[PDB]
């Protein structure tokens, strides 16, 4: 799919978004949750 050829991405702990299993923008994606400013 247009995300990535083989899908099967991580889904975030609080919502319905997806990222790459090591990737570092998940990591502030959290924090924002978290409410980090
Ligand atoms: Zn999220």
Redesign the pocket.
């Known amino acids: 799919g247009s995300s990535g050829s083989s899908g099967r991405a991580m889904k975030?702990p609080?919502?319905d978004?997806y990222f790459m299993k090591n990737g570092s923008d998940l990591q502030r994606?959290i924090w924002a949750?978290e409410g980090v400013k």
């Open positions: 975030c609080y919502c978004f994606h949750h």
